[PDB]
Amino acid sequence: MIQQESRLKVADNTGAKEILCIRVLGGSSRRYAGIGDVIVATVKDAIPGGNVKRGDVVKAVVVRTVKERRRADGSYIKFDENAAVIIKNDNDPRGTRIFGPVGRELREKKFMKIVSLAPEVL
Amino acid sequence: GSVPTAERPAAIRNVALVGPSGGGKTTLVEALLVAGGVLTRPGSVADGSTVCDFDEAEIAQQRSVSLALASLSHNGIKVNLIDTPGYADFVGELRAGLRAADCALFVIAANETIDEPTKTLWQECNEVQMPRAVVITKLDHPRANYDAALTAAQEAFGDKVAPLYFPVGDGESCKGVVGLLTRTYYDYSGGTHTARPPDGSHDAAIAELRGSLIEGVIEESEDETLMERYLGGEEIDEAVLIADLEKAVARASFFPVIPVCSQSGVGTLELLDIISRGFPAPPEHQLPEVFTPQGAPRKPLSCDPDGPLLAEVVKTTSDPYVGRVSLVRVFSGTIRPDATVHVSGHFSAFTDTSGSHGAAAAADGSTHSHADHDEDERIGTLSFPLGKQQRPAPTVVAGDICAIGRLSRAETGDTLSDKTDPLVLRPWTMPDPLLPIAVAPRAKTDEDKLSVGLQRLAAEDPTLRIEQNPETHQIVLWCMGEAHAAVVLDALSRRYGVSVDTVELRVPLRETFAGKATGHGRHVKQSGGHGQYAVCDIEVEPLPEGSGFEFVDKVVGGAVPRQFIPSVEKGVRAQMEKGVTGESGYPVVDIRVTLFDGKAHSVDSSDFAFQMAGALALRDAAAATKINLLEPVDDVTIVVPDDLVGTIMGDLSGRRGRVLGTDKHDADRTVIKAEIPEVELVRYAIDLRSMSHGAGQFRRSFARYEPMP
Amino acid sequence: GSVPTAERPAAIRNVALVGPSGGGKTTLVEALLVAGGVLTRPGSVADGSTVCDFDEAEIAQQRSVSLALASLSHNGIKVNLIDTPGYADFVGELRAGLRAADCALFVIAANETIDEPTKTLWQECNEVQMPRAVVITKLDHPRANYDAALTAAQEAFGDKVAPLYFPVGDGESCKGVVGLLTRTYYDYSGGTHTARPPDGSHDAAIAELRGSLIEGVIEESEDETLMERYLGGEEIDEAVLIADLEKAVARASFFPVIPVCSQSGVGTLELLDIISRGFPAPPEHQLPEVFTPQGAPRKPLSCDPDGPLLAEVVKTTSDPYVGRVSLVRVFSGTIRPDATVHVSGHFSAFTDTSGSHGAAAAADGSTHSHADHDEDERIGTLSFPLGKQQRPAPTVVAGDICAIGRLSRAETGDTLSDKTDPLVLRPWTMPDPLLPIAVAPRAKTDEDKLSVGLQRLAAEDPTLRIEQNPETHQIVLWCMGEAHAAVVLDALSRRYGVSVDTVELRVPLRETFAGKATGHGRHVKQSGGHGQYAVCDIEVEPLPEGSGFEFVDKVVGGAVPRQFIPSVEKGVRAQMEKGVTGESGYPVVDIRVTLFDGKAHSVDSSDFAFQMAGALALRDAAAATKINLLEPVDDVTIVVPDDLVGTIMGDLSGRRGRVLGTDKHDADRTVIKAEIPEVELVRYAIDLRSMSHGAGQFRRSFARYEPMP
């Protein structure tokens, strides 16, 4: 349940560490973002030498949440941290590697690149 | 211009440039690269804008501390210049680069005489048959005497050293050099290289230099009639002579002298030509002897891209973004992405030799002393490292050094080969460190990850060894010297966040009895569980060192129960483990406990009770006589030059040391047999190297124990 | 399969495939290559697996945007297929392919008729007297009517167009064809090409087709008695008819029609047979006139490997790893690896005609204005283009096309020959791009390399014209159209790292005085040193157009010191140059300044002060009257169909164009001569191709300057 003003860890090579959620894309007045939802964010912390710097508005997709999320099978998934992946307009990562596990919801949202690059998909 | 990508190892050259600390190796590398056209202008070491001088430690120390690799293209031939550290503290990196290259370049200043570190580095290059070409740099210095450096190199590094190109200048900014074999003088005075016939002011000297170079080269050639032809008045052909010079230089026989003016760009183009033609080839160079994975040796493999897959890492580091920058040097076969290579850890058995005492085999790191492991890992992206930025490599043929990312278990020097045919090359002999240092964590959480941090650092730093002391309960890091110690501590506190503070290293120590005495132990403790009360009477006698712990029982009539004899015994063992000299009692050793008498109760006898009863009997016995402390004397094999044996005799005399002999190690150095207390050997390596100017090598090995003087 | 290698020019064929955009040319080439054995299975443009559509731009636009070459040898005869883009924006590449070809092939689909762009392509092919053959394709389309398209072709391009192969299909997927000359029906129903006599279902129509083809050919046959014999009932022999057809096609006198099923592979084998038999050979082809370096005409060389060396690069491509890949068209002599050949850079004298503002001769790149350059380069390894793969070639005989890499300064259109006999083939016709595109670099680092990148761009694409404005200081790219402009921008932004931003083209303007006026110029400034005082009273009166700057002196009593009057004149000239209209004043021409009075100080009079006073007086005089703005006008000659005359005339009526005359270009097009202001021509091309179904073709040339209405 990421929403306005939420802080997210970044799981990429882009060089950013933490981002702030500006808007949850996918409809007007939409409140929450779960795994597999695209948001707009701003970069708060970064590598000094990274391509992405502080203060630039970027587009990301949530890959991990602390709030439990139900699956159609009756099972539930949960993580210890809220994490996101920087993407470009064609739903492709800006980085080259992904850190940590991701939920399989990304598979049904057509984020094939993130799914392939993740070390583990759950 | 075009990215250097050669389709054959013969069109690839890799040179590990060597020299003193801040000798201009990087500067010459930048000048050459600009001559090749990779860099717009040659950067300055001090400015830190060069491709090689990018790391934090290299810029901070204002010199080369970790080696760097750059790729160059010249007339369709690839050149891989490899800057190497100029300080003996990082001579392990230089050794790896020499092992990583088929040619070495001595970057020295014309205003500096050849120092002993340079001589020892030349010896290290020499007894691996690694070819060398003498390079004279820093000719712009006001005191730059090219002729003095030339003569010193010829006199020191054998008669095989002889000038190849003769510089011409006004004494302040050399305006050109003269090509002896090409009889043509190249002039840079007007800002443009001009291969023109000499003006004739030094025609006789040039001709003499041509004759000397020819006769020196002929000596190492094949045609024995060439000497008769040249001495008979016949002029040998220029092309044939050149080919003969290439043979002499490649075969690790000749060491031509090259003047270089890096600042003005004078001589860089002709140096590139010499690298491209006269320098040895990775196929021609005597490749390290290959080994089967299971300990058997194997015939050396040809530097053929079509041959069996064969490679060896030369540097390892961790990058959060691109990944682990594993500098892998390819020797046989072609390396391609998506290929699973063998990651054998040197199969250290083949490198357990040499390495001085420490048996330096693979990545040192005594906690991981000798890797000797196997692994097959799928490589990721092949990249040609240009400083931080990596040049993509779609195909990497044999005879090249490349950086491979996303290698999970890769370490420095690990041999990379085919999964179907695992292979092991001969890794470099690494100068195991002999300066111990102790690191204490600020808390427990950092210490928990300290193990993996030091393991990763040792994988990155093959020359570094990390030692854990179980007796004194501390972790000890061994570094070659001071600057390398600073670099490794910075890397530990940065790449792994290890917050520690330097502390004194404590040597192992033991306690022994100086006399014989008897003890009385009375225990009374009536608690809420089982009432405890036991009395024991033992006897202890002094025993020679190395006797260990002993126990004799002579109780009469079964006064103390047999079941509680183990209780008393173990109580005495724990009490003597805790020591007898105050609250800081060192482990008492080589003592015999002799129990004779004791009293028993119907119910108050217990395991713990009798344990303390024996303990207190031990205290009472120790209270009656003296306790002698022993320190472990270690055999020290001191290797110093024969002229420096007098210095070692003089200083070891002030070190309470005894000399058991001075055996001549070789024509220059001398092995000195001596045993010294361990307290004197914490800083022996650093002072030895400082006094010997890098000529000091020594071994340590605990022998026995001696009392306090 | 095997590398197609040719040792005699006769066994080589070089035919350029042309047609409409997306005419399935790439699929046809893939099917032919599969029939040739080089490719295992036919590729698909939609899937992007085709050899021809391998570049990023082609796949991005899903259409041919750049031309490619494929080599195939069939029946011992090598064929050099030249696929070219079918869009008008890439007409120059098609013309370059035509020049490097000895025949022209039109790939058209039966389900669509001949469009006007295809007719203009036929005209362009015709105006080198190139042989042309009609290939009907896409016979798998439901609407594919071979009969309708055939008829249209016969009616349009005269009676010389008669079909050569008669298909027999179901109207959906053509199962085979009937050989008209051989009376043989070819079948592919079972997936195998089977040649059998026709069953007689078309025997009457077959006989009609043989009669028409024989009567058409035999006329073009030198034997005039053959017509009598055939009309007298004599059956002309099949081999004789074949040979006569081959000769007539080699004469560019006949245009046969051969149906082809690219998808099904039907007819590919016979098509290759027709290419190998009926098509002219380079020895048969009228080789282009070869010129001496100094412009003296030279006799054309016979197409033989033993003749004088004569070759010509026709394509330049840039690759990050390989480097420049130059395709070399050889006509005479033999090219061998490692040989030094002469590079004649078009000898611009033969291409200096016209060119509009850019005056484009070859390789533009204003710093390299005109090519006209001569240089001898040693080539490396000969290679033949197979997609991104390069099959090494041992030697290149005359009459073939080869790919050479690592070429430092070789350019498209350059004439390669023996260094002892430099030659110059007649350059191809280069269409003049008339779509200026002003851009602005994002940084000066990009700007410095912009000249190099644009020079290399014009080296790759000779049809792109680059002009840097000297008045408005704008870099302007002249392009053919939307797709060509996009390609030009993208290649500049990627292949050379030049970040540029398209900006508004500035049409140069001129200024002159609209009436007589006087100005009072005072320059008084009291700084920390010498004071300044100079006053000039000048009189400026209008002059006829082109009168230039005239100075009239009317100073009475020497109020202005006579040593400072030239300073006043210099200030007036500088003020004219800097403009007189606001902050963006255009240069002032055709004015007269009459200095009749002024003031000066004994101490505070200086030449600079009088310069400033004259400039300020000129500025005041300009502000004392009106300023005439002169804009340029370019004469435009347009070729458009007679049915659209009124629409274009009215469009020019809304474009303020002045009609000069409507000249009959031909039976269906009218040449329109008119002068249009350059402002109206910024987007004239795009709107015209609209106002013309692309049929709009025009040329422009600067005429003069006129004041704004």
Ligand SMILES: Nc1nc2c(ncn2[C@@H]2O[C@H](COP(=O)(O)OP(=O)(O)NP(=O)(O)O)[C@@H](O)[C@H]2O)c(=O)[nH]1
């Ligand atoms: N005058 C002069 N100074 C030089 C030259 N080469 C290097 N220097 C100077 O010496 C310092 C560093 O030189 P150098 O030790 O060769 O740098 P490095 O190659 O990075 N270290 P190392 O030589 O040990 O590999 C800098 O101040 C640099 O300007 C040279 O040819 N001439």
Ligand SMILES: Nc1nc2c(ncn2[C@@H]2O[C@H](COP(=O)(O)OP(=O)(O)NP(=O)(O)O)[C@@H](O)[C@H]2O)c(=O)[nH]1
């Ligand atoms: N029915 C049919 N469609 C075809 C055939 N060849 C190509 N096409 C279709 O036509 C389109 C591309 O044709 P084409 O213009 O010849 O491709 P191109 O060669 O890249 N362009 P160009 O013809 O200008 O050289 C694609 O949609 C492709 O599927 C064919 O033989 N039959």
